[PDB]
Amino acid sequence: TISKNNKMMAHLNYRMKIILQDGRTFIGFFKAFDKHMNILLAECEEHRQIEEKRILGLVLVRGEHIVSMTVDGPPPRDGGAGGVGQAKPGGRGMPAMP
Amino acid sequence: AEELAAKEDEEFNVGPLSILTNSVKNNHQVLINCRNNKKLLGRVKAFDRHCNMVLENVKEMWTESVAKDRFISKMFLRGDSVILVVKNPLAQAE
Amino acid sequence: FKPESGPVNHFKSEQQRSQKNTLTGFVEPAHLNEFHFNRQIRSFDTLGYAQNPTAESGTTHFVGDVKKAEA
Amino acid sequence: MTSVGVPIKILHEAEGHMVTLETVTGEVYRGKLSEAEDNMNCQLAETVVTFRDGRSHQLDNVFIRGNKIRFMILPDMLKNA
Amino acid sequence: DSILEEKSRKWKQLQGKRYSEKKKFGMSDTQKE
Amino acid sequence: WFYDHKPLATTRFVNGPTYRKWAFSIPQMSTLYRLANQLLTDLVDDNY
Amino acid sequence: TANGLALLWAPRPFNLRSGRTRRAVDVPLVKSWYREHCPAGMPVKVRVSYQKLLKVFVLNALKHRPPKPQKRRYLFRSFKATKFFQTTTLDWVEAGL
Amino acid sequence: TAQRFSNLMAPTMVLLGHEGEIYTGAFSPDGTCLATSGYDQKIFFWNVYGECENFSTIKGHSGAVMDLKFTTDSSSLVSCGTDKSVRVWDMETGTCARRFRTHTDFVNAVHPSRRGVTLVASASDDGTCRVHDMRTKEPVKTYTNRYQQTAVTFNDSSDQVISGGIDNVLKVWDMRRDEITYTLTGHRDTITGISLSPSGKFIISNSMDCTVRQWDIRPFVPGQRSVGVFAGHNHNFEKNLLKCSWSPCERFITAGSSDRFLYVWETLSKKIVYKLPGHMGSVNCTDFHPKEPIMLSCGSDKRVFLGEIDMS
Amino acid sequence: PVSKKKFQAAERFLPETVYKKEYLADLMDCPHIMRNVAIAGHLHHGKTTFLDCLMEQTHPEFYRAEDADARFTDILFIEKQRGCSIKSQPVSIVAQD
RNA sequence: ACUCUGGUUCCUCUGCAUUUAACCGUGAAAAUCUUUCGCCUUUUACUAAAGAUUUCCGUGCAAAGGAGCAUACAUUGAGUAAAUUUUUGGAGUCCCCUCGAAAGAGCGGGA
Numbered sequence A: 001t002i003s004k005n006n007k008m009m010a011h012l013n014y015r016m017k018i019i020l021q022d023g024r025t026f027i028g029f030f031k032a033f034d035k036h037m038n039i040l041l042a043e044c045e046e047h048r049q050i051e052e053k054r055i056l057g058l059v060l061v062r063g064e065h066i067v068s069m070t071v072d073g074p075p076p077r078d079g080g081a082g083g084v085g086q087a088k089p090g091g092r093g094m095p096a097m098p
Numbered sequence B: 001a002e003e004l005a006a007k008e009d010e011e012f013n014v015g016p017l018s019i020l021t022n023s024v025k026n027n028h029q030v031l032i033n034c035r036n037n038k039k040l041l042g043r044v045k046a047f048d049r050h051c052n053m054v055l056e057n058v059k060e061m062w063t064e065s066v067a068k069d070r071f072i073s074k075m076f077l078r079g080d081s082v083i084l085v086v087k088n089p090l091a092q093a094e
Numbered sequence C: 001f002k003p004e005s006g007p008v009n010h011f012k013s014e015q016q017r018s019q020k021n022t023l024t025g026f027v028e029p030a031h032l033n034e035f036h037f038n039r040q041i042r043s044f045d046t047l048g049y050a051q052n053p054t055a056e057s058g059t060t061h062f063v064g065d066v067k068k069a070e071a
Numbered sequence D: 001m002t003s004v005g006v007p008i009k010i011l012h013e014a015e016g017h018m019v020t021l022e023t024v025t026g027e028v029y030r031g032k033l034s035e036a037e038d039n040m041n042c043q044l045a046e047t048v049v050t051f052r053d054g055r056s057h058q059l060d061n062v063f064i065r066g067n068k069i070r071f072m073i074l075p076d077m078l079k080n081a
Numbered sequence E: 001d002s003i004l005e006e007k008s009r010k011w012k013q014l015q016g017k018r019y020s021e022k023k024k025f026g027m028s029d030t031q032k033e
Numbered sequence F: 001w002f003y004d005h006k007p008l009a010t011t012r013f014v015n016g017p018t019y020r021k022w023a024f025s026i027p028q029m030s031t032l033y034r035l036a037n038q039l040l041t042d043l044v045d046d047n048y
Numbered sequence G: 001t002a003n004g005l006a007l008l009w010a011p012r013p014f015n016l017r018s019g020r021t022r023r024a025v026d027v028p029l030v031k032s033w034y035r036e037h038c039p040a041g042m043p044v045k046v047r048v049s050y051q052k053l054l055k056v057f058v059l060n061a062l063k064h065r066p067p068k069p070q071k072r073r074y075l076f077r078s079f080k081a082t083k084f085f086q087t088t089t090l091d092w093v094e095a096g097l
Numbered sequence H: 001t002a003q004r005f006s007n008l009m010a011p012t013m014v015l016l017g018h019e020g021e022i023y024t025g026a027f028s029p030d031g032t033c034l035a036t037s038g039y040d041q042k043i044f045f046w047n048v049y050g051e052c053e054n055f056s057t058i059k060g061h062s063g064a065v066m067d068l069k070f071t072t073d074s075s076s077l078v079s080c081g082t083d084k085s086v087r088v089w090d091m092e093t094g095t096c097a098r099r100f101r102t103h104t105d106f107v108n109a110v111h112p113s114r115r116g117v118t119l120v121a122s123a124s125d126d127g128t129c130r131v132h133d134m135r136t137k138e139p140v141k142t143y144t145n146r147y148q149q150t151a152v153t154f155n156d157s158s159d160q161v162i163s164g165g166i167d168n169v170l171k172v173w174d175m176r177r178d179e180i181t182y183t184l185t186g187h188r189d190t191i192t193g194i195s196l197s198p199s200g201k202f203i204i205s206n207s208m209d210c211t212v213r214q215w216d217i218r219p220f221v222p223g224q225r226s227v228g229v230f231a232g233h234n235h236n237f238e239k240n241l242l243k244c245s246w247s248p249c250e251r252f253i254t255a256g257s258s259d260r261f262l263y264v265w266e267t268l269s270k271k272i273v274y275k276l277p278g279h280m281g282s283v284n285c286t287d288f289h290p291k292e293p294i295m296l297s298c299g300s301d302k303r304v305f306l307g308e309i310d311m312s
Numbered sequence I: 001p002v003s004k005k006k007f008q009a010a011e012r013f014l015p016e017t018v019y020k021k022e023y024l025a026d027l028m029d030c031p032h033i034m035r036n037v038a039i040a041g042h043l044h045h046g047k048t049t050f051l052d053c054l055m056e057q058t059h060p061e062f063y064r065a066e067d068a069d070a071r072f073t074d075i076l077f078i079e080k081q082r083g084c085s086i087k088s089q090p091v092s093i094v095a096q097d
Numbered sequence J: 001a002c003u004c005u006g007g008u009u010c011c012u013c014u015g016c017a018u019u020u021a022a023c024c025g026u027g028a029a030a031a032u033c034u035u036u037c038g039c040c041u042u043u044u045a046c047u048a049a050a051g052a053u054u055u056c057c058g059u060g061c062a063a064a065g066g067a068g069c070a071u072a073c074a075u076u077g078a079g080u081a082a083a084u085u086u087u088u089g090g091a092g093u094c095c096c097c098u099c100g101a102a103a104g105a106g107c108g109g110g111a
């Protein structure tokens, strides 16, 4: 998946939950990475067991400390176009009959 | 890409890695000491400069203290955990 | 399509009673397939028979020398 | 320059803004990132250090070695660059 | 068979000539020589 | 080719028989610039 | 290289190496001559004719009106498109006669 | 003033812009739009309401589009043509999601599976029914019949493929057996269209013999499967593949007609309820709006007629 | 009433840019990362035509003619006609070092 | 992994080429109307300027269809291939005090 360059983006912009080697859990929208597995998380938060929450912001995690990451949530979200004809109202002309 | 994955195997004829070289081709069990303070005893069937190995027919033992052990049919070991590899005197050539 | 009730004029002929739009019949625009239209002309011209052009043709499936059409 | 991954480029655009970074020993430094490097060595001006016990000091400058940074909090606007 | 066999031939010929590539929509706008 | 009717029309230097575009080399353009010289202005800029 | 450096300051079209073709009628071979000042010795006959040609040019350019973005009425294509006209190739003096 | 039956802008609407014989037309199951195509190869989309503006026009076929159906969730349009190809058009993207390039002759009809995994049954002048699964390039099933097949549908459970053609007999192919489990015999001439009732109990099948026969396709039937025969319409020398369709309440049936009239029959009595004039050539395809009493009819005259009917 | 008295260039729309506009607006809060720069010199020493390059780099749809200077910042029609910059025009852009 | 297409040259149709400083035209015609100058026993044909519209010889691009020539599957839009201090070849493990049934946590301390 990730870093297979034809599918580099395989989890980009997903909401992902990141576990660090100190046992912290960060959560955020994973939207960049590096060859050193550095990652940049937008709208990031941290979570701990009791569940305790804190807001961080745009977090850059140095890759050295990442244990693992998982998909937490979908990316945010929002017959084509053309045309030639017209569709004025009308009525049925009566034809001939036998 | 793969050129430096194939050229690698020259130095292992003579370097300290020879205990792995003999462990493979003559099929000696080796008692690979690892981090986690655990011992793996098994026949290496491949290895590399980084000291990865694939182990057949493994006995894992440690103290938990009371002795506990686990049997693993096949394993890949990441070489960064390898402290110390020993040709086990409790085994032989096979 | 409910038929007109009552008798019919003795004086007017069937030609004169007929539904019409011009002096001689009911002209109306049409859209045939150009290929099949040409096929039917040439069958009538060359063979003497063609498939019937009428809408609601009923039993009269062939026109012209119908004996050849069936044979 | 030669290409380098987006996280490092964004770090160079975090220069001149306030940042917060936590070191592997646990201390949290908030300051203004006056310089960054491709190895993510950081110079913080105007720094406030927060120890894990919650005490704090001001520090006029700090250099933190790149491989001793656990994570940073960049500013928000860099998501538009 | 043979009655359906003849009808199978007829349908092949009629459809092919009708939907011929040489008669699809836009063609027969001949160039003056 | 200098005195053909539509010179170069069939060659690579012009788009084709419709004769709508041309793309010359500097040996061509400089030989032509010489041959035109009796008709051309000596002025190098509009300031005159 | 010395020739290329010369072409850069050449009169148009020679500062171009590429472009669209023009109609033979469009190319006014002498127009550069009367745009610039009349040579010092030319008779009054000639000096006046320079001014008069200049006047035509100034009147043309003053009353330009740029061309309408409108449909191209191809008269002769509409003629070529009917059974009544055929095409061939002729010597110009034959077609002229 | 007069009675009204729908949100149509007028009791009859005439939709204009096609450039050739309109062979096929279908409503979106959600009722928002309808799609129409034919010899002009473009596929025109029309809103059912308001100005009925031609809001989109898909292009891509290199041949006449012989048949055209929406998938049941309305997210995709299946279409097939004389370019030997079935195509699935994504509605939100307007783009060819899949192109089942595997038929060897003209594809006459297409029908998507009603539910479950999306499968596309198709029938062709190569004599084969094929069922294409979106997930594979290769077809799931190829059912070689000996003679050209002109019409196809699944059953409602999407596990039998029903087809008809030059041999006049309808085949019913059972997709777990890969055999014809039974045939429906009774048409005197080649079949031009087959359509499956909303409940799936019945099919109609139109034929060049100028009859529509209703067949009972339920697994058990205690006797003869021929339910009834409708008549009134006519097939002319153009030999168009005149389609047929079901009212969404099943009380009414339609078929295309060469006599210019849009025919509606009542399913129970077999009486003609509507024989609407107004086309000027073969009414090739007819369909009902899925939620509201509106009739679609598509002519060889390049005209589409939308209009209200009293579905009493 | 339709007195087309235009005397300066005016853009109906915002042009596209390489940077997002929101990044420009947000950089305004940080005076460490901005510079206020005059460009000066003699007449016709290339000032405006230099700004044309920065415009072309930051605005993908910005058109430079192959044979005339765009002079984006000469917005007055008299500056267009006189061919010289007459009044100073500011241009704020985001640019990478 | 999906659908997307053979190059060239030519013909013809359709659409667009108004935010003009300026330019579809690095060239340059004719007409009509309104007005003002000069011819003049009248009108036409005119003089030479303004303003407003037209016609005519031409121009560009996009898109579609066809017609000739010789012939090639890649490639577009969507998306592939480094064990020596700063990341991806281990400074890792183990043991006491505290709160608490429960398991962690202190810049806690020790090997």
Ligand SMILES: Nc1nc2c(ncn2[C@@H]2O[C@H](COP(=O)(O)OP(=O)(O)OP(=O)(O)O)[C@@H](O)[C@H]2O)c(=O)[nH]1
Pocket (backbone or CB within 6 Å): I042, I043, I044, I045, I046, I047, I048, I049, I050, I069, I071, I083, I084, I085, I086
């Ligand atoms: N050779 C050459 N000429 C240039 C270059 N840049 C600009 N010019 C020309 O120099 C003239 C002046 O360019 P401008 O951009 O108008 O210079 P400017 O200084 O802004 O003019 P003012 O602002 O009015 O003083 C024009 O004729 C340009 O074509 C250049 O890089 N090389």
Ligand SMILES: [Mg+2]
Pocket (backbone or CB within 6 Å): I047, I048, I049, I084, I085
């Ligand atoms: Mg300037």
Ligand SMILES: [Mg+2]
Pocket (backbone or CB within 6 Å): none
């Ligand atoms: Mg008189």
